Structures are given as structure tokens and as C-alpha cells.
Amino acid sequence: NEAEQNAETVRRGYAAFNSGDMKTLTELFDENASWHTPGRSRIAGDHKGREAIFAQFGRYGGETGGTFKAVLLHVLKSDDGRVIGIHRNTAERGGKRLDVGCCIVFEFKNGRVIDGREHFYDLYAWDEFWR
């Protein structure tokens, strides 16, 4: 089904993110996708356009000496093809350590991601790390 194909695409995307494989990661996102990062840090906001998403992703890895990881724990689906990834983000940056849980809500258009929205459990921890 559609919903499981979208789940497969999410799994492929976490793997490609974690390995820095931005060529695969491209295939999986619509060129007009958005990415929504909550909170009050310098990397918060609505990043509109796949190019703006991948700049965000580049800051995630860039600013942590490539230590930033998304450890995927569970993948959930709606019958209509929405997908959530539950994960933990870990990373190091200037003597600080990140370890926070997150649910990303993925919306799809024609099998590609059109929207991703991060929901961190301890948003304060994320913001503290990025301060």
C-alpha cells in the first residue's frame, strides 16, 4: 500500500541522513517540501523549499563535526499515508552533548516528502544544545 511505501521512504531517508547520502535524500523530497523546527534557537523555523531543508540538514551535521545522528526507534502510518518517525537525536558540539527524543510528522505528495515537522519532547534541551 501507499502508506507502507511512504514508511519505506522514511526509513530510507533516516539511513541516507545518517550516512550523509544527500543524493538519495534528494530523490525522497519534493523540491517544494518544508521542514519545521520548533523552538527559539538560531536554527528554528519553517525552512521552505528542499534546498532550505538540506541547508538545515547541513547545519545539523556541519555544526557538530558530523556527530549528529537520528537513531530511528519506530515508524508509524496513517491509513492515508502520513508517517511518523520516532527517534533520538544525539550529537556533540563544543563540549555539549545532545540526547533528545523526537517525533517527526511526514506528509507526502506523490510518494515524496512535502512536509516534515519535528516535535521534540524536551525542546529546552534541544535549544540549550544549539545555544
Next chain:
Amino acid sequence: NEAEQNAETVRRGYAAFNSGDMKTLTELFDENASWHTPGRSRIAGDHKGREAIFAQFGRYGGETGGTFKAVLLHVLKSDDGRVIGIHRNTAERGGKRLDVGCCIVFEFKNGRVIDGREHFYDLYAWDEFWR
């Protein structure tokens, strides 16, 4: 399937929460369920035990003159019976208004909720409302 029965139970629980039907809401939670509220407000924390959950719920409604609502938007499932509810919470309290998005991760034991974990997008807004 198990996963869809658990989805049905989540839907029944949002409806029973929104109507104040704590008798139904009881049937749906294990007596040793936990509820996890993130953030730094006076209502944050790990509320362990169904009685502690329902005290939390009682504060949600109690402290907002019964205006607190969870508007359910989407229900997602893992093949293994985990469920997420995506919702918006709205409420009023002493001239402040709540309007925040949330994903709750539900874990099940024998068809009843054993664990619920709130993930607010704008956790600062939630904490501000409860200040």
C-alpha cells in the same frame, strides 16, 4: 488487527476525555499506566499510575474552567500496535489562550494504554499558558 483495535481505543479516549467521561477513560488505561508531560511548568513530569494520570487530566479541565480540549487531527499506527494521536490543545485560563499542536505516543498492554507521552511542537507556548 491489534494495531487497529488500539487505534480505536485512542479515538474512544480522546472522545471520552473531551466529554469528561472518566468512567470510559478508566476502562482504557492500565491501572499502572504512566503519562509524560514535558516542559518546566507546575504540571510537568512523569505521572505514574492511572490515578496520577487522571489527576493530571483533572487539572487540565479543572484549571481552565473546563475549556481545555484535545482536537484530534490524525491517528497513526505501527504494525506492532503503538499509536500516535496528532491533535491541537485549546483552552483558556485567566485571560490567556492555549493553542498548541501535540503528538502523543501511546503504548499498549493487553489492549489498554500503559504509557502516553506528549510531544508539543511549541513547548514554550504550553509552558507559558500554565505559568
